Design a protein around this nucleic acid. Structure first.
Ligand SMILES: [Mg+2]
Ligand SMILES: [Mg+2]
Ligand SMILES: [Mg+2]
Ligand SMILES: [Mg+2]
Ligand SMILES: [Zn+2]
Lengths: 337, 44, 159, 88, 138, 132
RNA sequence: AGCUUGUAGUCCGUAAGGGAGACAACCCAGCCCGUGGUUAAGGUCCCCAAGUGUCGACUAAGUGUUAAUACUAAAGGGCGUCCCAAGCCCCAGACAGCUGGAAGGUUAGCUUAGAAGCAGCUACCCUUCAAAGAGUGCGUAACAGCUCACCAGUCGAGGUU
RNA sequence: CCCUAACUGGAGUCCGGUGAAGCUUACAUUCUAGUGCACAGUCUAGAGACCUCUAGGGGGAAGUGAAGACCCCGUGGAGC
RNA sequence: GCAGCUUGCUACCUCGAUGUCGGUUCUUUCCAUCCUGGCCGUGCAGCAGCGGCCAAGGGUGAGGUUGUUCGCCUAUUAAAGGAGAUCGUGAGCUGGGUUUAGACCGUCGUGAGACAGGUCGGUUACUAUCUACUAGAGGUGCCCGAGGUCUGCGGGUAAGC
RNA sequence: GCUCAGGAAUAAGAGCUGAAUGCAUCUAAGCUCGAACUCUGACCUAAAAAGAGACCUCUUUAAGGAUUCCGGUAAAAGACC
């Protein structure tokens, strides 16, 4: 039979397609440290989109030296608190948590997520970790941070979000010293990312609920005379005669949306401090207006408004150091009508 | 350009007449299939 | 038809000319080669068979042609005396309905053999023995059975 | 020994590698590894390779010869690179 | 405990399987990553690659990658693991990569049969090499 | 070919009839195929501004009629955006009979043509009079 | 052709039980019930009862680990490896190398200028010395040397068909 | 049709009331190869499998409906 | 000699029914390689060819006639490869052809009728019991009681060509 | 709007060292390179991994969980925030 070849419908690199087990994106891989100690991640909340007019400066690009319009996503980033230090041990069966020390001072609203740890061992526990590193058992150190969404207004929740980050250094002793220095303090977004650099974004995407094969995998409808015979948006065949089973690679209906996704090489265009420079007339739709400091990201970002966005320094970047963008105009038109 | 060393180490070898594998000079047997007859790499 | 269609000996012989009909002729023209009038070759080697089978006449003709060419090219026109031995007396029939009255009709002729039975024989001098072996080895390549070469007379001379 | 027709070659020892620059109109220079302590010296159109390990020097020479082979033309008309005039 | 330092794989597995089935205390195989598998390099690699990529995703054979998992699977085949006797036997076997901390300094014994000294030639590979060729970090 | 600063949707579709706007001697043409387009299953070939495509003459002088030729699109009714942010559109599609390189057989072009074909094919730019 | 049609014996049909992975007709066995004992076919690393059994060799391919069998690949080749026999040269000295020699004449007959040992008749081109050639090849209009065949000094034990 | 998208009303999804029929030797959470009247969920050897429930389209149960309408046979019929 | 992808041969299964040809949709397997990756030879200057070896990751399209498979033709294209899955796929679709009952043309027959020749017309049934798969939940098992943050035995991928 | 490599081990193949067979030889041991293939690295999922996990905190007539109530970044019912 003279068959006409067609690429497979949809991608099997994301299966099974089920609801994310949490509302907070989790990072599986941390980059390699190539500089002084610092955190490798940050968190914020998505607001909406605008566009800016910036003098093009991408090297070797066609549109170099002339004005362009770019879509940007505005992200609110109130300062985070470093609440704990965690130590990991390496063996045959991979890393294993072996110690944690919490900060003495914490926010009273953290009681909504977990009961507040009490100030027991602080100096003795830290020196315990130091002795462990001194006897060459500890391999790496990670920091535990949370957000403080009570300062914002467009986000209804008042309970913090807890997650683990990574410190970037060239030695375990340096990581431990830096973690001791920064433990139990507030870290601003400027201390993590420099303006003009690239980042990686993770977030839970918008949920569409249960969807059929056509909208879930993008299969073809029924064409022509077949479009009015009873099956229009159903799949053609569920399999062959043999094997006598339906393969897992056949398109079917189920959950669509609310998965975890990652975007690569998004550029940071502006680190702001005052919210009046991005707020349109009438505020953003369904959000309100910006009150704290923010950040502008070139392009789009996964997830809807009022969703938590995690950021980490690039893991597969190609291009060399880019530079500070030259923003000329930031659109503050009404998003409404 | 015909030079002594280049021709010495480039086109001074025998060729199997069945699988086209190149062999040494003082040989009578393809090292990979054992065919009896070997010709010589074509000159100019 | 293919060679293996008529090569096994499973059924009785079928050779009486006066009962069957319409047997096609043969291609092999002469059964003696080279210097027939000479009788003073001290070495007499021959090609023998290792298994019972049937040889078509076309295979015998091809083997004879190739041996003739090799021997004449190397030994010389007067330096040998080749002689084929087995003549094709059998008859081959090919059905041509289905199995309804499946009895066949004559299509060719074949020569049955027996294990260790001589087929060819070449006589040469002492200086052309290797050429004789070289010639007899190609002839057995066209033949439908495994074949070995035996030096019958003058074994002490060559060996 | 070195041979070339039109494009002069810059054989330069640097670190544990031998860099071949401008080979048949080449912008990306090729790299040949040096095995062991096999000290090599470049002098005009010839290369001498010293050492105390026989397999080591042999493999170093083999790498240098194999890196500089032009693999899309005819050996009759193109004959360039480094060739061994005498084994170890 | 049994030290798998330089022992034939099938010989070791057969002895351990039989003396598990006889009924006793549990057994421990340590250093189960330099056990020997006699045979040429290419043939061993080819057979293990074909064993690895053979199943169907929902219900096909899931051949393990880790070295101690491979040794356990090899012993699992010389044993009626579907019956009650076999399941009880499988409950008393523990193969470790390297040396676990609790079995540190423990008294060892060996199977005198399965010895690489009892091999004619030098045509063999070690189990960790096949484990790393199959893509396992151990 | 050389990249364009702007982004052009592929509006016209294989089977479309365009009104050629030069003085070569043809009025209407029929897009047969598009140069440098692979495609996928069931998808008709499509062409946009600055795309060289083979056509057929449907209305014109008897000598030119029934001839397979090459031509490019100079205008299209489907909108496309400038580099600095703006959308441009026309009232009607148009095409000019040319050669493989880009020399138009006609020495006179009627009406405006998009500036992007003027940059991609300089000859069309020079032969035109008004560019928008 | 696990096709069709004969014939002798024995079977399945109508035949348990034991062994072959399962197996109508293949091997042991033709069978009333209960208990003890020894064997047949077949097996004895584990699954699985009983040998990680003994003696002498072979295979390096996971080849093989498959009585019969409707279930198991051929011609041809192998300076792969293990054996037998037959010839030939041989420590006063065989083979592979180290060496040079291959000098007398010739530049062989050759019309093209030239196929001058290597297009095309011939013959050992030396009376003579290991060698000396009508002679393969890098070279080669022709050659030419470099030198093929072919012997000679040289090592120092088996070599070769 | 390229190439599909949004929307409207009736069903469906969820809740209350009412309330049937048709396949059914038994068991049954399966998948691969072999074997077997040569097209096995049940035999042989492996591989997998914690149980219950809801929604969904129909891969398989050589799915169900039915003593084949095609071919042959019957010293069976009818019409012409 | 291999394959069983064309046509034959046989009559082992199915006549108290295993729903035919082609196309459409969707998934997968083989390599005996059309393009993409790597090599070898050439009577390979370069460009481009010719022949062979490894390699099945990705790609292999749009249209005119015809029911067609097959095949011819057109303009592109890196190329527009061939086969298997009950000649994959009718409890998914279609009904163009073949295969009922009606009628016409030609040829046979004395005639009823026939064609293995052509042409026009001609109903596509079912509420899913079991299993498989796609997603969503409730339990029980491990466990001091609860919460949080992680590791990673394993599974998937083309995520790029 | 984004959509990479780099590395390890290899196939055909190209070499080094090297004897049986004094020499020579890519192979008989041994070694070095070598593909859109394989593995690793990115990415999605994953303590119901029966070897059924690690660490920390809060508290054992409490911590904490559910139902009622006002809602939506979620939603066929459940679940989730
Ligand atoms: Mg009987
Ligand atoms: Mg029986
Ligand atoms: Mg009768
Ligand atoms: Mg069906
Ligand atoms: Zn060869």
């Amino acid at each position: 039979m003279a068959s006409i070849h067609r690429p497979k419908r949809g991608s099997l690199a994301f299966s099974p397609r089920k609801r994310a087990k949490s509302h907070i994106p989790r990072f599986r891989a941390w980059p390699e440290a190539t500089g002084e100690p610092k955190l490798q991640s940050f968190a914020g909340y998505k607001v909406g989109m605008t566009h800016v007019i910036m003098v093009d400066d991408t090297k070797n690009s066609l549109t170099q030296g002339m004005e362009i319009s770019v879509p940007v996503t505005v992200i609110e980033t109130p300062a985070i608190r470093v609440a704990a230090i965690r130590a990991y041990a390496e063996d045959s069966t991979g890393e294993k948590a072996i110690a944690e020390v919490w900060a003495a001072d914490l926010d009273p609203e953290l009681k909504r997520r977990i009961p507040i740890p009490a100030a027991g061992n602080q100096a003795e526990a830290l020196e315990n970790i130091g002795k462990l590193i001194e006897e060459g058992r500890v391999s790496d150190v990670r920091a535990v941070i949370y957000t403080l969404p009570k300062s914002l207004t467009g986000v209804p929740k008042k309970v913090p979000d807890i997650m683990e980050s990574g410190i970037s250094a060239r030695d375990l002793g340096t990581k431990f010293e830096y973690s001791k220095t920064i433990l139990g303090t507030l870290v601003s977004v400027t201390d993590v990312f420099k303006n003009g650099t690239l980042v990686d974004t993770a977030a839970i995407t918008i949920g569409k609920g249960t969807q059929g094969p056509v909208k879930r995998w993008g299969i073809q409808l029924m064409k022509g005379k077949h479009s009015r015979q009873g099956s229009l948006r159903q799949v053609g065949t569920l399999g062959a005669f043999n094997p006598s089973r339906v393969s897992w690679r056949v398109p079917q209906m189920g959950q669509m949306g609310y998965h975890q996704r990652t975007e690569f090489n998004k550029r940071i265009l502006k680190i702001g401090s005052d919210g009046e420079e991005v707020t349109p007339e009438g505020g953003f739709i369904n959000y309100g207006l910006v009150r704290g400091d923010y950040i502008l990201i070139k392009g789009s970002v996964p997830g809807p408004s009022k969703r938590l966005i995690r950021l980490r320094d690039p893991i597969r970047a190609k291009k060399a150091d880019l530079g500070e963008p030259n923003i000329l105009y930031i659109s503050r038109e009404s998003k409404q009508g | 350009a015909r030079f002594p060393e280049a021709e010495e180490r480039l086109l001074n070898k025998k060729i199997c007449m069945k699988c086209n594998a190149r062999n040494a000079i003082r040989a009578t047997r393809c090292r990979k299939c054992g065919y009896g007859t070997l010709r010589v790499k074509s000159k100019e | 038809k293919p060679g293996s269609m008529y090569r096994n000996v499973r059924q009785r012989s079928f050779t009486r000319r006066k009962y069957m009909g319409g047997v096609p002729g043969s291609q092999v023209i002469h059964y003696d080669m080279g210097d027939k009038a000479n009788t003073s070759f001290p070495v007499k080697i021959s090609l023998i068979v290792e298994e019972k089978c049937q040889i078509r006449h076309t295979a015998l003709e091809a083997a004879r042609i190739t041996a003739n060419r090799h021997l004449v090219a190397d030994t010389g026109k007067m330096g040998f005396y080749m002689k084929l031995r087995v003549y094709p007396h059998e008859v081959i029939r090919e059905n041509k309905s289905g199995m309804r009255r499946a009895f066949g009709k004559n299509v060719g002729t074949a020569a049955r053999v027996k294990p260790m039975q001589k087929i060819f024989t070449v006589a040469v001098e002492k200086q052309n023995f290797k050429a004789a072996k070289e010639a007899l080895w190609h002839a057995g390549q066209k033949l439908p059975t495994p074949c070995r070469i035996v030096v019958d007379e003058g074994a002490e001379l060559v060996q | 020994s070195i041979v070339y027709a039109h494009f002069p070659m810059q054989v330069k020892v640097d670190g544990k590698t031998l860099i071949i620059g401008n080979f048949l109109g080449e912008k990306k220079p090729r790299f040949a590894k040096i095995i062991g302590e096999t000290k090599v010296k470049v002098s005009g159109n010839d290369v001498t390779i010293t050492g105390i390990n026989k397999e080591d020097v042999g493999q170093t020479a083999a790498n240098i010869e194999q890196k500089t082979k032009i693999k899309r033309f005819d050996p009759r008309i193109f004959q360039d690179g480094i060739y061994i005039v005498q084994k170890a | 405990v049994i030290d798998a330092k330089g022992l034939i794989l099938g010989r070791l597995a057969s002895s351990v399987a039989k003396q598990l089935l006889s009924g006793d205390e549990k057994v421990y195989i340590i250093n189960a990553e330099q056990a020997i598998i006699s045979g040429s390099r290419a043939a061993t690699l080819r057979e293990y690659r074909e064993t690895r990529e053979r199943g169907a995703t929902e219900f096909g054979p899931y051949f393990p990658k880790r070295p101690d998992r491979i040794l356990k699977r090899t012993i699992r085949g010389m044993l009626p693991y579907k019956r009650a006797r076999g399941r009880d036997a499988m409950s008393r076997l523990k193969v470790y990569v390297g040396v676990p901390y609790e079995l540190k300094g423990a008294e060892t014994v060996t199977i005198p049969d399965a010895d690489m000294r009892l091999l004619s030639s030098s045509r063999y590979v070690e189990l960790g090499e096949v484990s790393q060729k199959m893509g396992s970090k151990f | 070919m050389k990249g364009m600063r702007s982004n052009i949707p592929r509006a016209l579709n294989a089977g479309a009839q365009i009104a050629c706007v030069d003085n070569t001697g043809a009025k209407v043409v029929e897009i047969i195929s598009v140069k440098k387009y692979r495609g996928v299953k069931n998808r008709m070939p499509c062409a946009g501004i600055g795309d060289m495509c083979v056509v057929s003459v449907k209305k014109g002088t008897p000598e030119m009629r029934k001839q397979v030729l090459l031509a490019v699109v100079v205008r299209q009714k489907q909108e496309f955006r400038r580099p600095d942010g703006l959308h441009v559109s026309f009232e009607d599609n148009a095409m000019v009979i040319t050669d493989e390189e880009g020399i138009p057989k006609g020495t006179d072009i009627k009406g405006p043509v998009a500036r992007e074909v003027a940059e991609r094919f300089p000859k069309i730019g020079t032969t035109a009079s008004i560019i928008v």
